[PDB]
Amino acid sequence: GKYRVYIDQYAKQDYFTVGYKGPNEMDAGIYYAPYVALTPLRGSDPKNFQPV
Amino acid sequence: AEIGGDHGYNATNIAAGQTSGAVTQIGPAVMGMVRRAIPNLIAFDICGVQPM
Hints:
The structure is cut from a larger assembly and holds two copies of chain A.
Chain A: no helix or strand
């Protein structure tokens, strides 16, 4: 009734980490602020012609 | 822009796979089969063909 447990796949030795969450997006400990998304960069080299 | 390569120029490598990069092949595509033909017969009208 209280905790949403998320399991870390790659745990090193052993631990459990309890955290808090709020109703807003400010109410947290860390912020992941997105910016410009994945960039489809392309090109080619005109001395071997193989793409990149 | 990636390493494929040649099946090492000897029939044993070209058998199934064993390339130089990482494209390891299934195997050469079969084409057909060739065999000797049946030699022809020199008549039999030059002798006797009397049955027994």
